[PDB]
Every structure is written in structure tokens, then in C-alpha cells.
Write an enzyme that holds these catalytic residues in place. Sequence first.
Site, PDB file in Angstrom:
ATOM      1  N   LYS A   9       0.827  -1.202   0.000  1.00  0.00           N
ATOM      2  CA  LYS A   9       0.000   0.000   0.000  1.00  0.00           C
ATOM      3  C   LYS A   9       0.862   1.254   0.000  1.00  0.00           C
ATOM      4  O   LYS A   9       0.541   2.244  -0.663  1.00  0.00           O
ATOM      5  CB  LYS A   9      -0.884   0.018   1.237  1.00  0.00           C
TER       6      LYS A   9
ATOM      7  N   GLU B 241       3.704   5.699  10.885  1.00  0.00           N
ATOM      8  CA  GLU B 241       4.226   4.391  11.245  1.00  0.00           C
ATOM      9  C   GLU B 241       5.711   4.229  10.952  1.00  0.00           C
ATOM     10  O   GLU B 241       6.324   3.255  11.390  1.00  0.00           O
ATOM     11  CB  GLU B 241       3.436   3.304  10.521  1.00  0.00           C
TER      12      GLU B 241
ATOM     13  N   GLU C  18      11.319 -26.538 -20.348  1.00  0.00           N
ATOM     14  CA  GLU C  18      11.474 -27.959 -20.066  1.00  0.00           C
ATOM     15  C   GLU C  18      12.914 -28.453 -20.196  1.00  0.00           C
ATOM     16  O   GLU C  18      13.261 -29.496 -19.642  1.00  0.00           O
ATOM     17  CB  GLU C  18      10.526 -28.768 -20.948  1.00  0.00           C
TER      18      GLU C  18
ATOM     19  N   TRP D 185      20.536 -32.190 -34.640  1.00  0.00           N
ATOM     20  CA  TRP D 185      19.620 -31.920 -35.737  1.00  0.00           C
ATOM     21  C   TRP D 185      20.223 -30.928 -36.730  1.00  0.00           C
ATOM     22  O   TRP D 185      19.508 -30.343 -37.545  1.00  0.00           O
ATOM     23  CB  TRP D 185      18.296 -31.393 -35.194  1.00  0.00           C
TER      24      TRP D 185
HETATM   25  N1  LIG Z   1      13.053  -4.358  -5.653  1.00  0.00           N
HETATM   26  C1  LIG Z   1      11.903  -4.992  -5.360  1.00  0.00           C
HETATM   27  N2  LIG Z   1      11.531  -5.878  -6.266  1.00  0.00           N
HETATM   28  C2  LIG Z   1      10.410  -6.550  -6.002  1.00  0.00           C
HETATM   29  N3  LIG Z   1       9.631  -6.406  -4.924  1.00  0.00           N
HETATM   30  C3  LIG Z   1      10.034  -5.482  -4.046  1.00  0.00           C
HETATM   31  C4  LIG Z   1      11.167  -4.759  -4.198  1.00  0.00           C
HETATM   32  N4  LIG Z   1      11.401  -3.879  -3.180  1.00  0.00           N
HETATM   33  C5  LIG Z   1      10.319  -4.076  -2.404  1.00  0.00           C
HETATM   34  N5  LIG Z   1       9.461  -5.058  -2.899  1.00  0.00           N
HETATM   35  C6  LIG Z   1       8.157  -5.472  -2.401  1.00  0.00           C
HETATM   36  O1  LIG Z   1       7.334  -4.309  -2.207  1.00  0.00           O
HETATM   37  C7  LIG Z   1       6.407  -4.587  -1.151  1.00  0.00           C
HETATM   38  C8  LIG Z   1       5.677  -3.272  -0.751  1.00  0.00           C
HETATM   39  O2  LIG Z   1       5.745  -2.974   0.653  1.00  0.00           O
HETATM   40  P1  LIG Z   1       4.663  -1.960   1.231  1.00  0.00           P
HETATM   41  O3  LIG Z   1       5.023  -1.312   2.524  1.00  0.00           O
HETATM   42  O4  LIG Z   1       4.276  -0.922   0.261  1.00  0.00           O
HETATM   43  O5  LIG Z   1       3.475  -2.918   1.407  1.00  0.00           O
HETATM   44  P2  LIG Z   1       2.390  -2.477   2.409  1.00  0.00           P
HETATM   45  O6  LIG Z   1       1.087  -3.083   2.066  1.00  0.00           O
HETATM   46  O7  LIG Z   1       2.254  -1.009   2.527  1.00  0.00           O
HETATM   47  O8  LIG Z   1       3.049  -3.082   3.646  1.00  0.00           O
HETATM   48  P3  LIG Z   1       2.740  -2.558   5.035  1.00  0.00           P
HETATM   49  O9  LIG Z   1       1.420  -3.013   5.466  1.00  0.00           O
HETATM   50  O10 LIG Z   1       3.785  -3.057   5.914  1.00  0.00           O
HETATM   51  O11 LIG Z   1       2.864  -1.100   5.133  1.00  0.00           O
HETATM   52  C9  LIG Z   1       7.338  -5.234  -0.138  1.00  0.00           C
HETATM   53  O12 LIG Z   1       6.646  -5.981   0.843  1.00  0.00           O
HETATM   54  C10 LIG Z   1       8.183  -6.162  -1.019  1.00  0.00           C
HETATM   55  O13 LIG Z   1       7.540  -7.438  -1.132  1.00  0.00           O
HETATM   56  N1  LIG Z   2      19.422 -37.582 -34.449  1.00  0.00           N
HETATM   57  C1  LIG Z   2      18.162 -38.027 -34.375  1.00  0.00           C
HETATM   58  N2  LIG Z   2      17.833 -38.837 -35.354  1.00  0.00           N
HETATM   59  C2  LIG Z   2      16.569 -39.285 -35.324  1.00  0.00           C
HETATM   60  N3  LIG Z   2      15.625 -38.969 -34.420  1.00  0.00           N
HETATM   61  C3  LIG Z   2      16.020 -38.136 -33.458  1.00  0.00           C
HETATM   62  C4  LIG Z   2      17.270 -37.637 -33.387  1.00  0.00           C
HETATM   63  N4  LIG Z   2      17.469 -36.794 -32.338  1.00  0.00           N
HETATM   64  C5  LIG Z   2      16.259 -36.801 -31.750  1.00  0.00           C
HETATM   65  N5  LIG Z   2      15.330 -37.578 -32.442  1.00  0.00           N
HETATM   66  C6  LIG Z   2      13.893 -37.631 -32.272  1.00  0.00           C
HETATM   67  O1  LIG Z   2      13.469 -36.400 -31.653  1.00  0.00           O
HETATM   68  C7  LIG Z   2      12.400 -36.667 -30.736  1.00  0.00           C
HETATM   69  C8  LIG Z   2      12.272 -35.506 -29.717  1.00  0.00           C
HETATM   70  O2  LIG Z   2      11.519 -34.455 -30.325  1.00  0.00           O
HETATM   71  P1  LIG Z   2      11.079 -33.198 -29.445  1.00  0.00           P
HETATM   72  O3  LIG Z   2      10.899 -32.027 -30.336  1.00  0.00           O
HETATM   73  O4  LIG Z   2      12.049 -32.957 -28.352  1.00  0.00           O
HETATM   74  O5  LIG Z   2       9.712 -33.762 -28.913  1.00  0.00           O
HETATM   75  P2  LIG Z   2       8.700 -32.861 -28.141  1.00  0.00           P
HETATM   76  O6  LIG Z   2       7.385 -32.836 -28.809  1.00  0.00           O
HETATM   77  O7  LIG Z   2       8.529 -33.299 -26.744  1.00  0.00           O
HETATM   78  O8  LIG Z   2       9.156 -31.484 -27.886  1.00  0.00           O
HETATM   79  C9  LIG Z   2      12.850 -37.994 -30.122  1.00  0.00           C
HETATM   80  O9  LIG Z   2      11.788 -38.702 -29.477  1.00  0.00           O
HETATM   81  C10 LIG Z   2      13.401 -38.759 -31.327  1.00  0.00           C
HETATM   82  O10 LIG Z   2      12.338 -39.487 -31.955  1.00  0.00           O
HETATM   83 MG   LIG Z   3       9.778 -30.779 -25.489  1.00  0.00          MG
END
Ligand SMILES: Nc1ncnc2c1ncn2[C@@H]1O[C@H](COP(=O)(O)OP(=O)(O)OP(=O)(O)O)[C@@H](O)[C@H]1O
Ligand SMILES: Nc1ncnc2c1ncn2[C@@H]1O[C@H](COP(=O)(O)OP(=O)(O)O)[C@@H](O)[C@H]1O
Ligand SMILES: [Mg+2]
Lengths: 482, 482, 482
Positions: C37, C62, C303, C316
Amino acid sequence: QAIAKMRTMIEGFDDISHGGLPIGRSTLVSGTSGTGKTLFSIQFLYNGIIEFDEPGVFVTFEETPQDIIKNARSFGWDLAKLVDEGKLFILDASPDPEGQEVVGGFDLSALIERINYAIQKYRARRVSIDSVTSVFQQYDASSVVRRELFRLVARLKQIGATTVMTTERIEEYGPIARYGVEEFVSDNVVILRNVLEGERRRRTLEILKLRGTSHMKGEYPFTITDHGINIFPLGAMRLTQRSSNVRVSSGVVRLDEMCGGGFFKDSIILATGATGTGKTLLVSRFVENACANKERAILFAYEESRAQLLRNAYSWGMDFEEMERQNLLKIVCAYPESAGLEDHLQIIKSEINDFKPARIAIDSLSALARGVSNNAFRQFVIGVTGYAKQEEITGLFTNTSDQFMGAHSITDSHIAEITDTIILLQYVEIRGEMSRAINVFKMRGSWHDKAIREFMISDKGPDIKDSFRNFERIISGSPTRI
Amino acid sequence: QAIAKMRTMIEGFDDISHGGLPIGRSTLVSGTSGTGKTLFSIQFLYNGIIEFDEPGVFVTFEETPQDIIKNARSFGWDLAKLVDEGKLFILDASPDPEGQEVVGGFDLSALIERINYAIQKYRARRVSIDSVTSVFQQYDASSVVRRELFRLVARLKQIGATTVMTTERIEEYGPIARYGVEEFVSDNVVILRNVLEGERRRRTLEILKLRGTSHMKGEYPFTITDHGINIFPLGAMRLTQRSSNVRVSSGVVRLDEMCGGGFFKDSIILATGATGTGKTLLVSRFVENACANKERAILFAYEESRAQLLRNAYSWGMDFEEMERQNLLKIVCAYPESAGLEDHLQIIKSEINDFKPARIAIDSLSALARGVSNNAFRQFVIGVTGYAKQEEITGLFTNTSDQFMGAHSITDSHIAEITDTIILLQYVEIRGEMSRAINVFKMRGSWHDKAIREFMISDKGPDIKDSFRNFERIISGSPTRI
Amino acid sequence: QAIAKMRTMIEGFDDISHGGLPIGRSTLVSGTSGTGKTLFSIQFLYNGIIEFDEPGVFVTFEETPQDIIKNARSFGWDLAKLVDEGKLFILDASPDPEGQEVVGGFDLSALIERINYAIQKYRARRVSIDSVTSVFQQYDASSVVRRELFRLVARLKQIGATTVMTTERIEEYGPIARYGVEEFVSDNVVILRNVLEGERRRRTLEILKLRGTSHMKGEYPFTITDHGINIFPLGAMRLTQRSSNVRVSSGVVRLDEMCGGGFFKDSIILATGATGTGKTLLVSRFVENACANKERAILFAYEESRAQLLRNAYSWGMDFEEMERQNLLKIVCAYPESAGLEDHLQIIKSEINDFKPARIAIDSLSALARGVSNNAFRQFVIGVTGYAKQEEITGLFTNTSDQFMGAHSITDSHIAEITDTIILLQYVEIRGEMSRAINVFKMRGSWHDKAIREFMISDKGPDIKDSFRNFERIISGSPTRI
Ligand SMILES: Nc1ncnc2c1ncn2[C@@H]1O[C@H](COP(=O)(O)OP(=O)(O)OP(=O)(O)O)[C@@H](O)[C@H]1O
Ligand SMILES: Nc1ncnc2c1ncn2[C@@H]1O[C@H](COP(=O)(O)OP(=O)(O)O)[C@@H](O)[C@H]1O
Ligand SMILES: [Mg+2]
Ligand SMILES: Nc1ncnc2c1ncn2[C@@H]1O[C@H](COP(=O)(O)OP(=O)(O)OP(=O)(O)O)[C@@H](O)[C@H]1O
Ligand SMILES: Nc1ncnc2c1ncn2[C@@H]1O[C@H](COP(=O)(O)OP(=O)(O)OP(=O)(O)O)[C@@H](O)[C@H]1O
Ligand SMILES: Nc1ncnc2c1ncn2[C@@H]1O[C@H](COP(=O)(O)OP(=O)(O)O)[C@@H](O)[C@H]1O
Ligand SMILES: Nc1ncnc2c1ncn2[C@@H]1O[C@H](COP(=O)(O)OP(=O)(O)O)[C@@H](O)[C@H]1O
Ligand SMILES: [Mg+2]
Ligand SMILES: [Mg+2]
Ligand SMILES: [Mg+2]
Ligand SMILES: [Mg+2]
Ligand SMILES: [Mg+2]
């Protein structure tokens, strides 16, 4: 005889209330902060003065008259003008902002006498109070509040003016009023709510009771616009409609043939099927045909921007921009998230009332369902369907399926039951490759083609072929050759 | 001997209570604001005076007698007349609206003596109190309320008049009364509720207990009409019915043949299937046949307006307007949302009692299910089914499936179990094109055709063909040729 | 005329509020501990001074001014500098940390006079208070708080400066303020929340009301960065976009051919299918093609780590490291759990604004869905989709299916409805062995190949073959030879 009512001239309210508020009695309007209780109060007195030439009194405890006027102005009317003319009077009973002394029950007696004077002076017929709790907050006893409200209600009844009292709540589904007595003392109780569900707020109005008379029951949704309160009592909608035997073209010749000579002008058409089946093409041709015959039409777009609609239309041979230039075609683009579902209804009605279209089309109903419950969604669809039919506007709607080559083009929404004509599109697997199929499922007012036909999409628009003879299980999405 | 009861003459109530209220004892009626507690009280005294010639006393604390009379008038009766005749007396014990002094427990003693006087003066048999809390609100102690109510109950018991006391609640499922003692002091407790679920209100009545006697238990729904309280105790409905061997025509010859010579007059017929299978045609022919034989019939429409029903009927060769002119056919159109489910039941009974039809038909049961729970829905259907059979009215009902060419025409509602004759319609895929199929699934009182037959719809009405010989898996919606 | 507003220059806020805060009135900002706030309050005054050259007053009860400055510094600005320059003034009204005496209502009068002085002295336009409860906590009475806040609000209104008052809550969905009166006294109410669901916190801002004017309603999510408060009002996003007819290559020739000559530059492409179908290959080729043409691109990885992406790319035939060396390809790796979903949106926008890519790609949307609700997920996807299209950035997204050789490559997420081009990959069973299939399901702006084709993956990338002629039921995952 029976109890007479006074019309508020507030849209929807007068139908829910069966004629407005009981005359010579008070009505208690409650709700949490932000429900617009003070808007109802102002709009009530305002309409009385303008429509029935009935002077009124607004009693204020919480707000300076200067702000009451300034705030009211946002809705397109000038209350100060009405005050100068001797039609509206504001009774200032507010506490002193620079320091206020403690008072007893004499405060209520003094208040009422001033109200009585103001009513007599301006021959007021309509009276309202912004906050009855302004004289209850002075003490904690609930038994005292019962009596104090009783005195206020009975006294204004002696006068005979129709009264709208305002009170307040903390909770949406909790007690009607702070002390748990007020709703028993008042003979007529109305509650406004601004309910938070998910991340969205939905405003509703309910009449809890009106002693000695009748009304509609339950919560009826409403919105607030630049014209004030607008209530949408769907249950008050009528089935009295004018049917027609007039046919209109969809822009697609083979489709018109399947429908037995086009679609009925007064009908509602629903096209369903998986994404990419060309539902947007049928919509584009529908509005295009209207324009071709110099009829006005409105397209309500949710999934694609105007720039993209123009591009896609050109790729199918339709000059949307020209239809706009001739003031035949309107494009209304908005995200479902930009407005409440009830606001989308208001937007649709507003654009229609302004442009006076012969036809309308909805780009996607499933888009509007995205952020709402099934109940909110179906009520919206019914409301639009009813309005469009009552106004004799040809309507085209769409509903996207999530079945990718799975056919089974059915809706969990069940909109088809209230709609007249159903068009089904689906993808099918033929000889190892994907294609499309079209079928007219039903049409209430006519014979229709029962065949399931193949179709394709070209730069000239849709291309409908003949039926899938010697195939089985087409409806599964995976037909077999036999 | 055993405890005797006094009939209230309130529909449904006297059956739930097994004969009315205990004589010479009080009953405490509770509930939240807006439940119509004061209606029960007035209707009770009113019926006593009219039906049994029993004078009564109404004790008022919260309302001026002028409003009691004025409000009662809305239900078609004049209490002022009964007062002038010396049958009804209203005891005014209200607080002074212009300023009321604080009183002690002497207020209860003074009250009772005035009540005793009024009872003796008018030889009252029936007495009621609008608000017992009028003398409890004076203080916070719950232990005091226990004693004060005890004194009031015991004192009226000394007199011997039957008493209906009224109290109040804040919550629907919370404490029976404000101080949490009152329901233990009273020997006979009844609670009214106006429960909000979803966006709708549903009124119920329950008898919590009657010491020394028996009653039905649970919540029994009710509505309020221009005749006062009308309770619908479905559990009190009887299976004692008169069966018949009389046959009636459906208007469709091949269907009558499939049913073994038409349908039984006392039977209930349910037609199910996907939208567009012509269920509305079977309904139209059903009521048309009744009219053809100069029998009265009522159609209850939910999905289509009268104007549209007329158009669709003409397209199938049926002159609905002529049948209306002869006062044989009635069209009753309403949206499901226009009334509570229990009100639809009351509407159906009202129209039947007035018009005395030989047959009725429901346009859509699935429409009525739209806005209600499965429990509310099935109770409605059972209630209508029972009534129609008890009244020996031929009934035709419909239930729409959501399976688009998916056959499997079954109901989650399971209404077929209580219905006599079942007709199933479905869409099928034949040679790459859509068609329709009809089957008589069952008929309790007769032999029926087991065949699954193809049919079509023409301008002359339904066209039923022979069975799908050499096909398999028709019931799946996708038959195979073999 | 109408009420004017003052821009806060806080991103998102000014759009939600329709122009900022009402001028000459107070706004009450509430919320539980930790909602930031005091950040809103500081950022408000700060922006006024920097952007509009408007001096302001910060009232503290405060916190020592030393900590106010020290804490503000974390956001990249020096308030002490603004104080020295006579632009910012901090009014120290804190209690004595070494022992504080009890005071009465004179404390409020003394406070206001000091505020008035400071406002006049520095000609302040913007004023804020860190804690209004600093003078309410002194007593328990809620009726007193109503009056005390009224006095403070009305007095600052006399001055005419725009005011931001801060109060506090215990609960997220409970009362707006501690005494349950404050939100009725204030005419403009804003609530901050830090809602805990599951194990995660989600910050939101809501405007409950602004008397006399309009605003957007509901909870709008926000985050806090090193630049202060950043709100993401998705409902305020526009459909006004620039369409294009420019085509770009995916790096895969046969795919470009299936899409009718490549993909549109302004389009969004979604590739779906089971894990291991090579979705990561299509992504790698997409960004590679951009680099091949000397266009900048960003890959957002969820992933797989960079080290693994490099290895898989080399297998590839794609030299990712070289594309990084030329500053064409950026790799951004993070776990879904490392940031809030709304922070991922901010990260994506930040990297794009910095690097100015022609194209972007998302490694996995299903990964981001892993820890969030369906509502949170879809809003994220829509936000990214909108931004990328508005910025004319070619976008490639993926969505993994859980169907192992089950085909039916559909999404419960339904992102395809807002996306332009859909590519479906699936595994199929052929002659007792597993293989892969590719199909272009749709493309809004063009003709596309409808065929379902077999494909394989080699060290040269994807290998697309011809259609599965003489097969049926491919879409089931288990085709039959015929
Ligand atoms: N650099 C920063 N990056 C990300 N978040 C930050 C950063 N600096 C501060 N914060 C966040 O900003 C929030 C804001 O605090 P603030 O006092 O405004 O909340 P508030 O509701 O007023 O708290 P309070 O009730 O104690 O007064 C902090 O609690 C912290 O989580
Ligand atoms: N050199 C290669 N020769 C043939 N098939 C390959 C080779 N390298 C990887 N693969 C194929 O690539 C697939 C992975 O594809 P990917 O794009 O990672 O799948 P996803 O849909 O999860 O993202 C493997 O399951 C395999 O069948
Ligand atoms: Mg994948
Ligand atoms: N032009 C407008 N368009 C849309 N909405 C508006 C417009 N002008 C005002 N509003 C809305 O009208 C609402 C009504 O405020 P109102 O005072 O009547 O509510 P209330 O329940 O009485 O609030 P309070 O408890 O503070 O008195 C405002 O909160 C605002 O959301
Ligand atoms: N003609 C009518 N048709 C239908 N409903 C009516 C009609 N006239 C009155 N009503 C309903 O009858 C209800 C009964 O009011 P009643 O006073 O008996 O309820 P209550 O529980 O006693 O309310 P309260 O707590 O104020 O005393 C009214 O609130 C109104 O909804
Ligand atoms: N010029 C074109 N030639 C052939 N097909 C096209 C052409 N332009 C677009 N399409 C087809 O139009 C389809 C999009 O149809 P559309 O109506 O937008 O589907 P939806 O049901 O989602 O609304 C694409 O998937 C593609 O098959
Ligand atoms: N004159 C007609 N000739 C042929 N078929 C018609 C004609 N008029 C209407 N239909 C058929 O009537 C069907 C509507 O039947 P209806 O009873 O309304 O279906 P539902 O089961 O929903 O109630 C249409 O789908 C169409 O097949
Ligand atoms: Mg107000
Ligand atoms: Mg579309
Ligand atoms: Mg009553
Ligand atoms: Mg029908
Ligand atoms: Mg702080």
C-alpha cells in the site's frame, strides 16, 4: 380498494415491482458499499420531476449537496437546475465536518419536522433518505434502532409521501441491515448487491418483500450506464412475437437450397462445429448478402480484429470496407473480458437501436462463455435471442466445438433448443486426408435437405458438393468406405 | 383421550399437520423477513370465521390495524367487514409512533389481560400474535425471554383458545428464533423460509415438532397467490387412482397401430429424442385429435410463441386458430424463467381446473429443468404426473436429448420410470445422409410394436415407414448395412 | 461540468480508473499487510513531481522518514533529492518510540492544520497518508471512527488537494476496513490484495467505487518490479491491430508448402501433439530460420536447459551457439515455478522490448499451465497472444498432449480458438510399429494442405512424406489398412 403503486420510470424495475413502489409508504433500499444505492434514490426523484411533474425531497446526511449535484451530472442531467426551478429540494442534515457534537433522540424528531416542512413547501410527492443509519450509528442498541426506524417510517406515512429510505450492509449474503431489525420494521424491502465471484463483480437487484401486494422474486441483474440504472428482468420477457413467411438469402446458393429456399427473416440461425470449419465465412457471407440487397447489418466480433477481418474477407472475395463506406456494414470488435456479459447484451441492444439493422451476426458465442458460468451464459443467449426475434432481426450465431476431426458436433450449452435453424460443420477423414462436411440439421419453419455433404473453401467463398454416398459412420469423424 | 386438532383450512397445511393445530395450545411460527408469517396468521383467523363461524383475535404490535386490513384485502377478502360484524377483533398494542416510553414486565401482564378480555368479549376460538419479540426486544437477556414467553404461552393455555404466535429469524438455517430459547418453550413449532439459492427464492414450510402428537416431517414447498398460502405436500399425494381400458387416438394412424390400438385415456405418454425429430409435431397432432373429437385440450408452450406455433401448425396442415375459436384448444405460453417451478405446477392445475380438458400436453420438460436442480425438477414432474392421472387427464410430455445423430435416447431425469408409454425418436445416418427413426419402447397396458421404423415429416404431418431390415447398430446412431 | 481526474502515471492503473483519481477528493486504499500500500502512495507522489512537476506531501505515522527514503530507493529513485529540492515534503506525525502519551480528538485537528500548512508551503497538489488508523486505533468505537474519518476527508476536500489515504485489513475477502465504516465514508475506494491460494500468492488491485464517475470493475492482477507497481488490465487490451500479407519461412520446406507459401509474419502458430513428436524441432527450426535471414528471435525455454538445447540442436544440424554469437538468438531458460504466471508475462515483454525480436517462440505452454488454474492460464495466453500481435512479432507456441499414440490431439485449454495457424502432430501404429503424422489443421489467412502425412526425424531435421492413402481411422491413433 387495493394498494396503488407509483412508477419509478426505471427500466426493468417497474416490471419487477409490478407497477413501481407502494404509494404513501416507505421502501427500504439496502446493500454494501459501491452498489449505487444513492443512484437509485436520485434517479427516482429525478424521473418523478421530469416525467410526472412531481416535486421531491432528497435528505442528505453523508454528502454535501454540492457533491450530490456534481455526481448526478455524470448521468446527463442537471439537478441544480431542478432545484432553482423549485422542483427538487435537498435537505442538508449532515454533521459538521469541522467538529460535531453528540445528540439524542430529539435529532430524529427535529429531522422529521424539517422533512415535513420541505414536503409541504414544495408539495413533494417523492421523498428519499441517503442513509437512515446516520441516526442509528449514534448508539449500539438494536432495540433502539427498531423503535427509531419505526418512528421515522410511521411519521412519513402520516404525511403520505412515497418514500425511499437507504440503509447499508457489510456482507452480500449476510443480514439485510446492520442491526438485524430494520428489514422487519420496513414494509417494503429492496436489496442491491455487487457480488464478487471469481475475479468479477455482478450487480443485482432484489425485492425481498412488499407487504399487501405482489412482485417478481429473486435476483435480477443490472448495470449502470450514462443514463443511470438499467435492469434486465429476463423472466419478464414475452413470448408474444410476430412470425413471418419471408425468406432471406445467406449469400450461399447451395445452402439456401438446402434450407428449402433460404432462411426465414424472423428466424435465428446457429452454426456449430470445430474451429477452422469456415464458420467465419458463413458469417461474412450472411452480412455481405444483407449489404448486397442494401440492408443494414451488424457484425459483433470477438476473436478477430477489424484489420484481420478485412484481410480474411478480401481473401474470400468480400469487400468489407466498401460495405462500411456505404453505411451498410458495421464492425463491432471487443474482447469478452472488456465488459460484463450483461454489458455485452446492453452493447448489442444499443448498436441495434442506433443502426436499425435488418440482420445481426455474432462472431462467437463460445468466446463469451469463456469467462462465465453456464447459468450466466444461457441467460445471455436467451436474452439476445428474445430481443432479436421481438425486433424482427435476422440473427446468425456460432458455437465452436473442441472436437478435432471428432465430429459429434453437439453443444453442452444446448442453445439449439431455443434456436430455429441449425447448421452443422465438421471435419472428416477421407482416403488418408482431411476434408469438411456440411449438414442442415433442422429448420422449424420448413423442409430441409437431410444429406451430409462434402465442402471446401476457396477464394470465391464456400464450395458445397454432393452427399457422401456409400460411406458409413460419417458422424463419428472417421467414415468408412463401403 | 388423545390431543384434538383444529383445521386451518389452509391447503396442504392440514395434511402435513395431520388435521391442523393442537387445540388449547399455542404454535410458534418463525422465519426470516419476507416469509409471509403474517399471512399465515391472518388466513388462519379468516378461515376460522368464514368456514367454522369461529370468532378470533389478532394481536398487533408492529402494524396499524388500518394497514392490516388494507394488506389483507389483496387476497380477495375484507377483514373490516368481519370486524364490523363482531367476528374479528384486532388488539392494538403497538408502540406510539410519535414517541414511546420504556416499560417493564408489567407490559406482558397488561397485554395478556387485554387479550383475555377480547377473547371473552368475542368468544374467540382462534388467537394470533404478529410478533412476540415486541416484548422481548425491550431487553437483551435470553434467560428473561425464556421466562417471558413461558408466561405468555401458559397464560393463553389457561384460557383455552388455540393460539398462533409469530417470531422471527435472521438466518435460514440458523437458530429457530433470536434468543435461542423460544423453540424450547413453545410446544409446537413451525418455520417458514424463503431460501435463496442461485438467483432464485424458494419458499418452504416445516413443522419442527408438535408435542404429544404426530405430523409429516421435512420442508414442504409452497407459494403465495391471490387466495393466500398454497402448500404442495407431494409426499401426501396418493397412489389411489382409477385405471381405464379406454383408448384414444394420437392423430397418427401408424402410431396408434404401433401402440396396439391407440393410447390409454388414463395413461401418461413421454416422447423423447434429439431436437428437430418432430416432437412438436406429435404434440400438435395429439391436441388436434382431441379437438377433432370435440374434446378440450391444453397445450403448455415453453420454447415457441403462439405466433410461431400457429405458423408451424399450418405448415403441417393443422388449423390451430380454428380449434381456439371453437374453445377446444388453449395455448398457454410462458418462459421457464417467468415463474418458479412450483408456480408452473400451480398454473397447470389452475388452467385445468378452469377449462376441464380431456387431455393436456407439455411442449418441453427439459425447458423447465433448465433453471432448476434435479431434485426440484423430478418432484415437479411427479406432481404433474400424479395430478393428471388422478384427474383422469390424458397427458403427453416431451424430453429433448442433446445427442445429435448419437441415438442413445436416454434421460438423466429418469421420468420414463413413472410414465406409462414411451416413444423414442432419433436421427440416423443412412447412405451418407440423415434420416429419422421412431420406436415404441414400452406400454404398460398393452402389446406394442417392437420394430424400429424409419419416418419423415411432410406438410400432411408425420410419415411412418417400415422397419430397418438388414441393418445393425441402429441404436448407436450409425447403422451398418448388412 | 463533470468530475476531472488526475493521472497517476502508474501503468495499468490509469486505464482501469479511466484517467486516474478524482481531483480535489480523497481515495482510500486498503488491503492486508504486505500488499505494498505504501508503494502505491510513494509512487503516486513521486510520479507527480517528476512527470507533471507537481509537489506533494507524504504523511507518516508508522515509519521514520529515514526508512521511507531508504525503502523507496530500492525502486531506482531518490526521494531525499526531491525533498532537498523542495518538491517532496514528509510530515512526521509518528509516535515517540521511547514512550508515547495518550491523546484525544485534538490530535486530528492538529494533524490537519500541519498538513494544510505543508500543502500551502510547498503548493502541494498531491497528498497521501500512510495509515489513517494511526488515529483510530486510539479507541474502539466504530461510530467515532466514522466521524473522525469524515472530518479528515472533508477537511482535505476544503483544501482541494488530491488525496490518497491508506487503511488496512485483516482478511482478503472480509470487511474493507477494520471498523466497517471507513468504506462508506470515503467516496473513492481501492483495495489491494495478496491472496494465498494453494501455496502461491497472487496480487490484485480493485476499484470498489468512485462516486460520480466511471471505472473498470473487478480484480486486476499486478506485480511489483524494480520500477514499482505494474498492473496488467487484460480487459483494457485492444483488438485494434495491423494485419499483414507478408510471409515468413518456418525453416521447413514441406511445411511452408502445406501452409500455402509459409506462415504470415503477423500470425500466431500453435503446434500441438504428444510428447516426443518433435515439437521442439519445429521450434528450433523456426528460430533458426529467423537467424538465417539475420532476424532476431527469442526462445523461452521451460522444459530443457540451455546445455541440453544446444546438444539437441547439434544433433539436428543447428548451431545454436553461433546464432547466439551473432546476437540473433537468445535463450531464456526458467522453470514455471521460478516466477508467477503474471511475472512470466512481464519477463516475456521485457526481453522483447529490450531485444526487439522479429519472432518469438515458447517451448511449452503446458509447462506454464502446470501450477495454475485454467482461468489464470488462459488469461496469460491471451495476454501474450495480444501483445505479440500488437507488436507484429511472429509467434510460435506449443501444447503437449497426454495421449500416447492416442491421437485425438485436442486441447482442454482451447488456445486454438484465438490462434491463427494450427499444426497437429501425432503418433500412429503402422504395421506393428510406431510412426509419426503431421497435419495442418487450419490457417486463417490462407489455403492449406488438408492431407494427413507421415513424417520422421533425422539428423538433418524433419522429414515429411506423402499422405496415408488407403488408410482409415488415422485420427484414432490406430489406422486400419484398406
Ligand atoms: N526491488 C523490489 N523488487 C520486487 N519487490 C520489491 C522490491 N522492493 C520491495 N518489494 C516489495 O514491495 C512490497 C511493498 O511494501 P509496502 O510497505 O508498500 O506494502 P504495504 O502493504 O504497505 O506493507 P505494510 O502493510 O507493511 O505497510 C514489499 O513488501 C516487497 O515485497
Ligand atoms: N538424431 C536423431 N535422429 C533421429 N531422431 C532423433 C534424433 N534426435 C532426436 N530424435 C527424435 O526427436 C524426438 C524428440 O523431439 P522433441 O521435439 O524434443 O519432442 P517434443 O514434442 O517433446 O518437444 C525424439 O523422441 C526422437 O524421436
Ligand atoms: Mg519438449
Ligand atoms: N458514467 C458512469 N458510467 C458508469 N458507471 C458510473 C458512472 N458514473 C458513476 N458510476 C457508478 O455508479 C456507482 C453508484 O454510486 P452510489 O453512491 O450510488 O453507490 P452507493 O451504493 O450509494 O455507494 P455508497 O455506499 O458510497 O453511497 C458508482 O460507484 C460508480 O461505479
Ligand atoms: N396478491 C399477491 N400475490 C402474490 N404475492 C403476494 C400478494 N400480496 C402479497 N404477496 C406476498 O405476500 C408476502 C407476505 O407478507 P408477510 O407480512 O406475511 O410476510 P412476513 O414474513 O410476515 O413479513 P414480515 O416479516 O414483514 O412481517 C408479501 O411479502 C408478498 O411477497
Ligand atoms: N483463400 C483461401 N482458399 C482456401 N481456403 C481458405 C482460404 N482462406 C482461408 N481458407 C480456409 O478458411 C478456414 C478458416 O475458416 P473460419 O471461418 O475462419 O473458421 P472458423 O470456424 O474458426 O471460424 C481456414 O482453416 C482455411 O481452411
Ligand atoms: N413442411 C415441412 N415439410 C417437411 N419437413 C418439415 C416441414 N415443416 C417442418 N419440417 C420438419 O419439422 C422439424 C421440426 O420438428 P419439431 O417437432 O419442431 O422438432 P422438435 O423435436 O424440436 O420439437 C424440422 O426440423 C423439419 O425437419
Ligand atoms: Mg451513496
Ligand atoms: Mg473464427
Ligand atoms: Mg408481518
Ligand atoms: Mg420443440
Ligand atoms: Mg507501508
